[PDB]
Structure formats: structure tokens, C-alpha cells
Symmetry: none
Subunit: 124 residues, 2 copies
């Protein structure tokens, strides 16, 4: 049984642009692959920020990126998070928890929009 | 050259104003006003979380929404956050901290803005 007791904190990577902004260096296809293996995690409690939130999903695979949005438009900050995994295995394993119950509330997890809003084909 | 279709349109942002995920996106202008009051907080490390992060910005105004994205595909888990305030006063006060040091590292804060490509749901 391995348990992280402090340490392991190392985020000293800024790239150094001083104008980083919203993006990260990914090609259009890096972006497609990540959303294909991304999930939407909604109605998450404000208590489950990135560290706690990843832990639950990390059991289903390896996380590549995560985006968490909290709206106080509702007075109470609600959380929605998009978890983007490294593998397709992980997304499929995560979506299986779609209607699981977490912290007393039922959360919802489904892929970050892989649906057909009409015709969709990479090559036509 | 073979041109089956003459395509000339404008590049509209997808994340933020379009994809709110499964929920239906709130008003277009609610979205505009929030961007106009939004800041980009980058280089925030994985050690900070939403509560801690809000506290620093809450000192400079009232937060309406926040979006935090952490990338770990680079191996190192990094953080970027978009803080959306309720007042324009707050965004201006927050951007004044563009050069500052938080948790021992220099972060970068400047205004954030998304836009919509068009939102419609076809019934039948």
C-alpha cells in the first residue's frame, strides 16, 4: 500500500511567455484525441477541486488535462469539470460512473461531446 | 485546383460560449459581460485550489465564475485559471497584479474573453 505523504509537488514549469493566455501548445489533432477521451463531470461539489477530483478519476486511468468551471451565477458555486484523459480506455471507464453518487449528490459523467449533430465523417 | 465548396467564414471560439457541456448555455450577453470582467490567471501552481485562488482575487472584487484548467500532459501539473468577476471594477483591479508573486512564483493575470460560433438545437 503506497500512500503519498506530502511531497510530490512540482509545478515549476511556466514556459515563460508572460502572455501564456488560455492556450497550451497542442495541434488540432492533439485536441481531437483529448476530447475523444475526455469526460464531462458535472454537478461536482465545490469541495472536490482538482487534486480530489483527479484522485477519483485517476483510478480510471491517466489524466492529460482537466478543466473545471464553477458558476456563482447560481449564488452557490457549482462545479462542472471536463476531465481529459491520456487514453480512450480511461474515458470509457469513467463514463461507466455516469450516474454514480458522490459526496451525497448524484454527479453526471459522460464524454465531452462525441455525438452526431448531423453528418460527421473525418473523410468524405 | 479542386474546390467543391467556397468556404469563407470567421473563426469563432468554441469553448466557453458554445460548449457549456450538456447544460444549455446561459445568455449570450451574460457571457459577454462576464468575459469583459474576466481575467486570466496563469502559472498558478497545482498547489493552489479554487478556495485559495478566490480568496486572493476576492480581495479585489466579487467573483461570478471561475474556470481552472490544469495540464499534466507535460508531466508537470500546471494551472491556468480564468476568473470571471461580477464587476468591471474587479477585473481592472485584478489585472493590476499581472506582475506579482503568489505562493513563491510569479503569476500572470490579464483579461480573458470567449465568443460563440452559434447555438441552436433542432427538435424534429
Amino acid at each position: 500500500a503506497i500512500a503519498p505523504c506530502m511531497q510530490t509537488t512540482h509545478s515549476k514549469m511556466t514556459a515563460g511567455a508572460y502572455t501564456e493566455g488560455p492556450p497550451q501548445p497542442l495541434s488540432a489533432e492533439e485536441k481531437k484525441e483529448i476530447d475523444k477521451r475526455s469526460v464531462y463531470v458535472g454537478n461536482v461539489d465545490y469541495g472536490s477541486t482538482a487534486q480530489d477530483l483527479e484522485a477519483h478519476f485517476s483510478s480510471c486511468g491517466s489524466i492529460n488535462r482537466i478543466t473545471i468551471l464553477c458558476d456563482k451565477f447560481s449564488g452557490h458555486p457549482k462545479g462542472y469539470a471536463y476531465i481529459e484523459f491520456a487514453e480512450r480506455n480511461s474515458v470509457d471507464a469513467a463514463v461507466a460512473m455516469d450516474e454514480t453518487v458522490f459526496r451525497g449528490r448524484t454527479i453526471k459523467v459522460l464524454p465531452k461531446r462525441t455525438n452526431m449533430p448531423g453528418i460527421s465523417s473525418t473523410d468524405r
